[PDB]
């Protein structure tokens, strides 16, 4: 069949700033079982129908996986504005795919908190669609240049989520998977059942 | 998590060697044994319980008991003495511990 379990059943998940892109090709993709599963809280699809996923075949399908807080799931859309939608992960305005999100408070939330999940807060420009920036350099907040040391006007470009079990809805970790259906430039490789 | 192996092995040449890894309820977890010769990168002598990787001598034999995992090296060849470490994964602590 197609490898989809590893994306939706991995023990660990990538951070927003360093979101992982999994390339999928030469497989029989059964998107129906994903839609059937009630676990996925969000299954919004742009420019495609859930039933048409199996009916229509594509090639070079990509899967982007990352974890964001609950209230930021809205920012994952073709047209949106936010700190994570402009500096961490930006969808193209003509995006054609499904965004899948589900609560994972029982796995990612550590009792005391951890630095496993973190997001980028400072960036001079806006990311282009389907672009990732994993550079970790001291951000410069004024005329005076900054060295390796960080202090006033010298900010580390990453901040860590405070995922804890006590956090209420809207701050608990939510797994997010973005499926990008690339146009059939090449011969079809990822077709439905 | 609290891996503890005594740093005193003086097995006579040719005799069977035994190295013990001390850990609470260590039988449930998987013990990984490593060997590092001086001036050399460490190598994986044993990864799983009594499961050897390819291309190593049969001398190195492991046995993860209920409370004390044991690394047994039978028919010790001349030389082949270095520092041995046992490491496990602690799910509760969420970080690998190499012991000492």
């Amino acid at each position, epitope marked *: 069949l197609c490898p989809f*379990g*590893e*994306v939706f*059943n*991995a*023990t*660990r*998940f*990538a*951070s927003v700033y*360093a*979101w*992982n*892109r*999994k390339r999928i090709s030469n497989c029989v993709a059964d998107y129906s079982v994903l839609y059937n599963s009630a676990s996925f809280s969000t299954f919004k699809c742009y420019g495609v129908s859930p039933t048409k996923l199996n009916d229509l075949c594509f090639t070079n399908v990509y899967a982007d*996986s990352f974890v964001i807080r609950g209230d930021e799931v809205r920012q994952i859309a073709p047209g949106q504005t936010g700190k994570i939608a402009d500096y961490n992960y930006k969808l193209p305005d003509d995006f054609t795919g499904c965004v899948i999100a589900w609560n994972s408070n029982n796995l990612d939330s550590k009792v005391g908190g*951890n*630095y*496993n999940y*973190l997001y980028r807060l400072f960036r001079k420009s806006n990311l282009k669609p389907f672009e990732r920036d*994993i550079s*970790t350099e*001291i951000y410069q907040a004024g005329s005076t240049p900054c060295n*390796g*040391v*960080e202090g006033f006007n010298c900010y*580390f470009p*990453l901040q860590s989520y405070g995922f804890q079990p006590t956090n209420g809805v809207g701050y608990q970790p939510y797994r997010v998977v973005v499926l990008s259906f690339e146009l059939l430039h090449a011969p079809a490789t990822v077709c439905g059942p | 998590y609290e891996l503890t192996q005594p740093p005193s092995v003086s097995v006579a040449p040719g005799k069977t060697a035994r190295i013990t890894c001390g850990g609470s309820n260590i039988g449930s977890k*998987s013990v*990984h044994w*490593y060997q*590092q010769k001086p001036g050399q*990168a*460490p*190598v*994986l002598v044993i*990864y*799983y319980d009594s499961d050897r*990787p390819s291309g190593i001598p049969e001398r190195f034999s492991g046995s993860n008991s209920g409370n004390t995992a044991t690394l047994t090296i039978s028919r010790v060849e001349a030389g082949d003495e270095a*520092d041995y*470490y046992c*490491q496990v*994964w602690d*799910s509760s602590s*969420d*970080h*690998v*511990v*190499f*012991g*000492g």
Partner: nanobody
Amino acid sequence: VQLQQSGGGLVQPGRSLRLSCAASGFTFDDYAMHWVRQAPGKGLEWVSGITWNSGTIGYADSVKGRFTISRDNAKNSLYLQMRSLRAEDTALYYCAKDSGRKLLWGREDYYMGVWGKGTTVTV
């Protein structure tokens, strides 16, 4: 397989450093990478680790809010953004590779089968 390393040098205390570990031979995106540091005349210590899907396994209790580990599967590069170094950080940092199975539904276990020559850092 070969795991070339670079970026090791003397660093003033309180500064920052970046370590890169170029990888070749094996499939970089199908294995978990680990950073292991060894002080001179001391034992091994697990610094950090990232799974196949760019998910940080964790950090050591000492280096938790100072070290950030990232990987780039496109160019098979492993990074460790060391920050606010102290005297204890002075050690030799290997770049090991986990040879375990894909971690799914939990069942997390790590054995660093393949290692590489490390780059010493002096603080």
